[PDB]
Amino acid sequence: TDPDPLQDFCVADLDGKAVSVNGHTCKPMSEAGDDFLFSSKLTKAGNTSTPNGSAVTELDVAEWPGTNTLGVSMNRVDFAPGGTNPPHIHPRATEIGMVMKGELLVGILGSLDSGNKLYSRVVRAGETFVIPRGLMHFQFNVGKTEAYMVVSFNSQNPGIVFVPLTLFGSDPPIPTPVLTKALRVEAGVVELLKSKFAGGS
Amino acid sequence: TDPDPLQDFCVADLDGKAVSVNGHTCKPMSEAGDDFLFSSKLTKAGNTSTPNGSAVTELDVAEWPGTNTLGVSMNRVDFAPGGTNPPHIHPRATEIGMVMKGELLVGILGSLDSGNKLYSRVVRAGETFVIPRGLMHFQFNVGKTEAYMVVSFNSQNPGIVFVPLTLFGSDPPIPTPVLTKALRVEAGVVELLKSKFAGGS
Amino acid sequence: TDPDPLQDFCVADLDGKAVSVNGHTCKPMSEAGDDFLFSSKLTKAGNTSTPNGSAVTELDVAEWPGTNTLGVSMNRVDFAPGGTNPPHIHPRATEIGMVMKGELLVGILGSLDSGNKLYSRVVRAGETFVIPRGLMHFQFNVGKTEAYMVVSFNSQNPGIVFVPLTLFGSDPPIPTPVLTKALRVEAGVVELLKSKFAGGS
Amino acid sequence: TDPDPLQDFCVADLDGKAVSVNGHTCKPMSEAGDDFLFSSKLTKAGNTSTPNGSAVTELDVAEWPGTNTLGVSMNRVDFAPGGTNPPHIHPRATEIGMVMKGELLVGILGSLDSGNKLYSRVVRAGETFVIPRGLMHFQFNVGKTEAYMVVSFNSQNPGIVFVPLTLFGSDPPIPTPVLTKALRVEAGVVELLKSKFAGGS
Amino acid sequence: TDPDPLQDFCVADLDGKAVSVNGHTCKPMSEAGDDFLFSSKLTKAGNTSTPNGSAVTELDVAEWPGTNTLGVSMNRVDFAPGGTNPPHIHPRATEIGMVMKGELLVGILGSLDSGNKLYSRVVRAGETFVIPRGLMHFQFNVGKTEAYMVVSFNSQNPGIVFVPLTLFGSDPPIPTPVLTKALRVEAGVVELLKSKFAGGS
Amino acid sequence: TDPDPLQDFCVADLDGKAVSVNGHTCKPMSEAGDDFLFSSKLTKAGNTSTPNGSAVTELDVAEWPGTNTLGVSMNRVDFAPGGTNPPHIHPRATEIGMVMKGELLVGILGSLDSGNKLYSRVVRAGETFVIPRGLMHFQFNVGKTEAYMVVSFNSQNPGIVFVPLTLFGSDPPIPTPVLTKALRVEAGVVELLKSKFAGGS
Ligand SMILES: [Mn+2]
Ligand SMILES: [Mn+2]
Numbered sequence A, B, C, D, E, F: 001t002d003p004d005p006l007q008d009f010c011v012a013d014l015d016g017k018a019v020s021v022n023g024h025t026c027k028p029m030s031e032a033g034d035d036f037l038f039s040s041k042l043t044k045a046g047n048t049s050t051p052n053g054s055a056v057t058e059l060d061v062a063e064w065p066g067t068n069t070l071g072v073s074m075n076r077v078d079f080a081p082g083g084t085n086p087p088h089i090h091p092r093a094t095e096i097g098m099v100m101k102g103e104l105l106v107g108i109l110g111s112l113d114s115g116n117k118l119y120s121r122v123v124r125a126g127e128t129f130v131i132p133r134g135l136m137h138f139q140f141n142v143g144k145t146e147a148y149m150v151v152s153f154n155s156q157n158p159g160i161v162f163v164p165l166t167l168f169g170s171d172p173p174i175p176t177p178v179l180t181k182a183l184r185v186e187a188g189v190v191e192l193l194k195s196k197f198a199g200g201s
């Protein structure tokens, strides 16, 4: 997990030419002000008119620099009816979330030694879920109304590996012949999938 | 921070005679079912008719055994108008929270090397805050309506050190002469304070 | 990363009814013998006549109990010509490997904040590679001969999330409608993919 | 706990304009000399003519830069007869100490899940005590002579949250109305307490 | 470093048939009493009439079970005039110590990338030293009186690798031919050294 | 163990005047190229015509900067017939290795609480071994042909404490009188040993 802090506060210095280190260098405390432990970036709903039908409003250290060194971060996800936060993975953290409105099918997948078990449940307002570090998971809006959830992570920068986008639209894309052997389908099927993720989202 | 997990899942075995270890032993996976990564315990508001005027609904590993080994936990706090979650400390975690309804004055205090600075702000619906590991902090409902927040921690068992209750109503209470030297007031003042925390809450 | 050790040795007790904890309980030192720090399980090549065209011979704590608490483990992967270790993820570790024979295209994919960059190179005998914790990666045999590599991990139980098998053949499988929204293709395409992973491998 | 070291030595560069990071940047090894692993700052007794009747001589990374990255630090506390190291907390470390001279009442308080138990004992020359990470604790000189102890921590910068001073004399002070609700006493009592900690110590 | 604690207290259960885990299982809190955070085992001087001319009084988790899970431990070392705590290593911790009486030559050795530098200084009453995790170090009494020091570690079980005893008197001893190649001397010299450590101390 | 990473990649900036921190600062991602996760430095055998009769080809972060922050590193050791990697220690990591060719006697020594037990075995092609963090260990070529092994570590910079060289040829050397008390032999024997390690290797 993220390294523990070695002082009370260390607000991230995000200017482009700052020296680079594991995580982020910090602003001098003299330049921090009173406001760094607070944020209002998750107050409004994100735009759900996207191919996935969901919008992620991030609140990691790049968006909330006061989280630097503190080992935590959050995000908000809004969903149009039938929208999905597609099968994805956080490489460096466990996720713990709460559904605020609507009805979401939440699915968590065990690794190979857990027999690739799929745990899935319809989670409603006020109900919570937990996603173990590095496991594949997804959310699907099964209600007729817009849904939204707010989650927390045990990292300032959990990272996100979107499975569909990484598999078919990385930069540059995984060679077709690699994907035909791995997916056990012909090249035409692989190219059809790639054509849907050519936009970069 | 909490030790990282060494397998996908390890639901806590909470029976009274289970062997004791750092954290908790786990139920055999065969006895876990499909439901351990989910909870509905924070769906309803807690009873705010208490001396503090707030109610904490806990969702640590004792209440949500599926969090065992995953490094995270949550809780919900409800506040009557003018109620407080009094100055307190979490010995083993950073807290990250969101106000869901109402208006809360949230205050975070730096340690001695930070000049004991008090950072405080009125946090409203959808706005977030972060409390660094082990620092004193509090919340006070400044609105005319009931307020509530949901927070996450970077520990399965953050712990809570309530300052007023620990100082004046521990078991057994800190001797009066220790408290008169520390608080710089006469014994009568110390005894008055102790009389308010004799109930254990 | 894995918790550090609190003593010299703690060989894993793998009997089925042993108490369950994070990681594994250990055999009494009196029952360990001289041989637990050694293994010969990776001496021979695995059977590459599988759908993927590769075979993984594991040497994690379940196969090498002397690794318990030491924070490390290994495995060997053998590849038939044109075979692949398909796009996969290790949820709890970084991997560091060496190609022993043959020619392998090794690809590592960055997360979303790294623009989903694909780093790929043909790695030959004696050459090494490193896969950051939790990122998607794969290997493909581009030579005309059988290839093999031996890798190490910074966990006693890294875990493996096989992307194709988890996406299309979990237990039970991810609903088709979830996968059609996520993959942006019709149900018939999703069902074709599922039919290839119905065997459990 | 503090991050582990990634090299033998990394003496802290404490100049005011050094770049800021978690912990401290280090002096080039060429500028370190032979003396950084040693100190004589705890050889003499501190001045106990203070309001608390005790004096803390710190030996954290700010006073002993050679501790940077090594995960440890110390301090010495001297006590006039009847003096106290008041109820306080270390946010980022466990403390382990030894009484060198005199008789000290040492008290350690459990958190809420430990029923706020007060463990207290008179500790004399050569006797030791341990304070778990983040718990409230104090020391009181019950002998007729000056007493002193030397303690170690499992952090280069444990931090110190003095309860009385933080509660009544932070900068700026916690509002009176917050403190009257939390302490369950009238404003006049709160103002009396605040008047004793207006000096900043 | 040692895993962080997941609760306030977890006194080690040291009975011989207790289940074995990383570190130690804990006594039920009901069986702990008030005394586990304290010890008087380092109050008296150890017997320095040994081949090394020094005596180590240990206060690790085997001798102080209340340290279990807290990440710290101590020990006391007493030295006859001209006695030594021979070149040794702690595999799992940094050491931080204070000389209480006498004059001790304290030497710390850097690793190969630090050019195997020897840092050494005569440390007197009240003066401190720090030994980075896993580096070779020693102490030698250069005064005419008995000397003693008390040290702390950042582990409940640091471990001790005595160089001379391990090299020449392990169980069973390292073969002579291995040692003649490594030490670049004839077999007769190696056998002479082995004869001095045949007693097991 | 090494601090976990807080981003995907952080290639070490090894220029001499780069700011110094725990571990290494990183190159801007814009200056990294595609090649940092790969290396060919262990493809060839090292020169075994040395006093020890073995050659270590290092692949730590100084030689493979792409390992920075990832918690892993490797090395290759080649051995002439009868050559040794002498009794040594890695202060900051566990080692896990595989013999690639030849026959090596591999010995691992327990600490004092493990009764200084010597575990030793002849390890051949494809067979593996594990060395717990900070314990003394060695390898000796018992075959008639050149032998070689490739090992991995759970640190980007494990460090190496060569016992013979550190004991008798540090800079500057440990005083003779310290070594005569510790080794229990006369000064002439100590000086003979020192004369063999005066070259610095
Ligand atoms: Mn997620
Ligand atoms: Mn709180």
Ligand SMILES: [Mn+2]
Binding pocket: C088, C090, C095, C131, C137
């Ligand atoms: Mn892999």
Ligand SMILES: [Mn+2]
Binding pocket: D088, D090, D095, D131, D137
């Ligand atoms: Mn203290």
Ligand SMILES: [Mn+2]
Binding pocket: E088, E090, E095, E131, E137
């Ligand atoms: Mn020592």
Ligand SMILES: [Mn+2]
Binding pocket: F088, F090, F095, F131, F137
């Ligand atoms: Mn080695």
